[PDB]
Amino acid sequence: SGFRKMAFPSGKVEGCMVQVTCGTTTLNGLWLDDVVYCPRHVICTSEDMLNPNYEDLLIRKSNHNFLVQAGNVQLRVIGHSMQNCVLKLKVDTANPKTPKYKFVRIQPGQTFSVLACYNGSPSGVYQCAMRPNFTIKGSFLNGSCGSVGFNIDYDCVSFCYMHHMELPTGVHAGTDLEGNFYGPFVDRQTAQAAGTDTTITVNVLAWLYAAVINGDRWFLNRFTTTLNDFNLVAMKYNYEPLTQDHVDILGPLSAQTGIAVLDMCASLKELLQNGMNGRTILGSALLEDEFTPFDVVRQCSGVT
Amino acid sequence: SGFRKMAFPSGKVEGCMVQVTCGTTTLNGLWLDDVVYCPRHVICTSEDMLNPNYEDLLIRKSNHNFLVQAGNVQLRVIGHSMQNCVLKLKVDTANPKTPKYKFVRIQPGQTFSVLACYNGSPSGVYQCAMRPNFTIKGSFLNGSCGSVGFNIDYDCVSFCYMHHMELPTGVHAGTDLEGNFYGPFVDRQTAQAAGTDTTITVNVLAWLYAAVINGDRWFLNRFTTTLNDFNLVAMKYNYEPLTQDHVDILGPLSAQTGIAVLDMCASLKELLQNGMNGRTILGSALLEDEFTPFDVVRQCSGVT
Ligand SMILES: Cc1ccnc(N)c1NC(=O)Cc1cccc(Cl)c1
Numbered sequence: 001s002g003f004r005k006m007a008f009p010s011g012k013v014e015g016c017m018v019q020v021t022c023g024t025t026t027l028n029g030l031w032l033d034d035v036v037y038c039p040r041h042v043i044c045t046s047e048d049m050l051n052p053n054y055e056d057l058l059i060r061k062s063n064h065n066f067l068v069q070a071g072n073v074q075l076r077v078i079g080h081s082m083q084n085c086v087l088k089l090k091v092d093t094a095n096p097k098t099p100k101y102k103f104v105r106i107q108p109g110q111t112f113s114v115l116a117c118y119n120g121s122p123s124g125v126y127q128c129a130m131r132p133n134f135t136i137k138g139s140f141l142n143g144s145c146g147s148v149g150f151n152i153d154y155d156c157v158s159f160c161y162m163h164h165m166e167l168p169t170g171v172h173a174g175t176d177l178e179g180n181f182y183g184p185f186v187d188r189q190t191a192q193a194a195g196t197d198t199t200i201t202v203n204v205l206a207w208l209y210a211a212v213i214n215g216d217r218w219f220l221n222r223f224t225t226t227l228n229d230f231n232l233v234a235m236k237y238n239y240e241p242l243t244q245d246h247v248d249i250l251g252p253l254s255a256q257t258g259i260a261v262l263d264m265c266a267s268l269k270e271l272l273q274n275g276m277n278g279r280t281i282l283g284s285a286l287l288e289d290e291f292t293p294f295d296v297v298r299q300c301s302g303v304t
Numbered sequence: 305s306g307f308r309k310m311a312f313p314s315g316k317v318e319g320c321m322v323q324v325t326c327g328t329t330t331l332n333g334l335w336l337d338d339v340v341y342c343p344r345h346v347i348c349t350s351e352d353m354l355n356p357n358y359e360d361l362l363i364r365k366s367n368h369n370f371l372v373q374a375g376n377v378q379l380r381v382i383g384h385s386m387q388n389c390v391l392k393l394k395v396d397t398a399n400p401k402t403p404k405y406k407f408v409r410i411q412p413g414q415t416f417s418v419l420a421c422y423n424g425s426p427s428g429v430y431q432c433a434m435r436p437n438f439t440i441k442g443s444f445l446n447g448s449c450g451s452v453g454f455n456i457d458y459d460c461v462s463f464c465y466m467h468h469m470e471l472p473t474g475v476h477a478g479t480d481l482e483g484n485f486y487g488p489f490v491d492r493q494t495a496q497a498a499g500t501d502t503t504i505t506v507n508v509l510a511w512l513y514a515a516v517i518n519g520d521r522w523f524l525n526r527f528t529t530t531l532n533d534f535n536l537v538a539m540k541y542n543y544e545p546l547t548q549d550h551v552d553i554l555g556p557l558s559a560q561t562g563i564a565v566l567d568m569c570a571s572l573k574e575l576l577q578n579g580m581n582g583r584t585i586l587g588s589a590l591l592e593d594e595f596t597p598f599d600v601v602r603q604c605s606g607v608t
């Protein structure tokens with residue numbers, strides 16, 4: 001009973017957080033095996049950020065200029081390299097708390113947990129979604145750079161995000177763990193605008209199925225629709241177009257509730273057209289799009 | 305930038321979760337030092353729950369009937385006692401991962417993080433608030449009993465909740481770590497109704513201050529009010545009455561924004577009277593009451 005914006009247990013990632021300082025800049029690093037991953041802008045001063053030439057700036061940095069602190073002890077840096085927008089610091093000690101892990105590049109619409117950190121220490125954990133415009137709506141302040149986004153499948157942590165930047169609109173941009181930015185953003189102090197933040201239709205549908213499973217059924221109507229008719233409505237309301245791939249992954253939710261995906265689409269269509277009329281669904285007065293079909297199944301079945 | 309329903313990093317609590325089985329009933333236990341805390345209904349069968357006499361049921365249970373498993377290894381039970389609605393199982397080994405901890409009984413309106421668990425394993429973490437009717441709106445399924453609620457102050461974990469029950473309305477009831485239920489609930493399979501779930505006014509005000517800090521200011525009006533005038537409005541909308549104690553703890557937020565508490569109350573008054581008019585505040589279409597003034601300060605300043 002009940003439905004919450006739930007994050008993965010953060011312990012396995014907490015044991016990986018370290019603090020990386022280079023000159024007078026301090027941010028968070030991720031220590032996995034004998035490597036510490038961190039945003040490359042750790043080598044920059046505030047002046048460098050206007051137009052940094054990271055290859056040129058890195059020439060003036062040696063292994064001893066990278067101070068890595070895990071809790072209260074100092075890691076010895078025996079190597080360094082730049083991979084896209086991340087620095088990889090080879091240390092002389094494997095992280096004893098390194099969990100089983102993978103580096104994955106997620107697609108927009110996918111969700112993940114964020115362990116927000118400052119000076120190598122965790123402050124909190126929350127659930128996020130990679131927006132269709134490749135930004136994330138996080139909760140990050142100066143010093144949160146290097147905080148990571150991840151998913152957990154039983155014992156394996158799949159790292160998918162490393163936080164780098166705050167756009168002038170208060171939305172966040174970052175990279176996968178290979179240092180490639182999500183979206184068109186660059187690690188530079190230059191105004192970069194985000195594209196249309198459309199709503200993740202498949203996720204709103206998954207959340208409507210979760211509401212039905214939990215007893216919120218007022219929005220169920222006597223109607224059905226087609227993918228093409230639905231998508232005309234989705235386009236008008238800046239919702240992502242729904243495909244048969246999306247319908248396929250909503251199948252287990254359709255099977256559990258007995259509500260055909262296209263019938264749920266017709267309920268969503270009427271909600272978009274009429275609004276909630278002062279009503280709520282799962283304690284929300286708007287349509288929630290940061291639960292994937294997988295998140296709904298996991299939460300509703302108790303996967304640990 | 306940004307504001308999220310953020311939970312405390314769950315790692316320190318994850319290292320405490322064990323699985324407790326008694327007969328054919330399995331639930332979660334909390335292993336701190338050499339004691340395992342769990343709901344006393346672990347000794348009950350489904351038939352016992354109709355009208356259990358826990359003192360009578362416990363006579364037929366010995367130390368060897370309580371199976372405690374931490375990860376994959378078995379803890380030896382050398383003692384057992386009932387304290388209110390919790391069982392305390394003395395084991396022969398101190399939990400090596402026992403963090404610094406305290407047992408605290410929270411007041412309604414206070415928030416905490418929940419590490420939902422099944423069979424001793426964590427599934428996820430989310431932020432909760434003890435409702436004014438002493439229930440919690442969690443996300444729990446059968447087997448989640450024994451999952452705990454907590455707050456963290458630097459290195460000290462303050463355990464405040466242990467989950468026991470699901471009311472017939474899908475809301476949740478439980479105890480502090482001394483086994484005393486929050487509210488009037490009893491650990492019995494008997495219909496027990498909850499009282500009025502009023503809105504936590506001081507928390508909605510704290511959240512309005514967080515919205516102002518993050519740039520959502522449309523709701524700020526040209527008005528002010530008094531505590532007595534505000535409370536007439538709060539009573540009408542089933543909001544908890546606001547006191548000078550509440551005003552005092554909103555002081556740091558008032559000081560940061562330059563918005564007097566009574567001016568923010570007048571903004572809240574107009575929002576209650578007029579609604580949001582299809583607008584949102586911090587990505588929400590309703591007034592959020594599960595952020596305390598302390599949560600807002602912590603999140604907005606980066607306390608780790
Ligand atoms: C101030 C803040 C708040 C939240 N999250 C953040 N990442 C930041 N920090 C920055 O954005 C600094 C920066 C400037 C230009 C390019 C890059 Cl890669 C990074």
Ligand SMILES: Cc1ccnc(N)c1NC(=O)Cc1cccc(Cl)c1
Binds near residue numbers: 445467468492
């Ligand atoms: C089924 C479920 C879902 C979510 N949270 C739960 N705690 C439960 N389990 C129960 O409520 C079982 C129970 C029955 C009568 C008294 C007590 Cl103490 C406990």
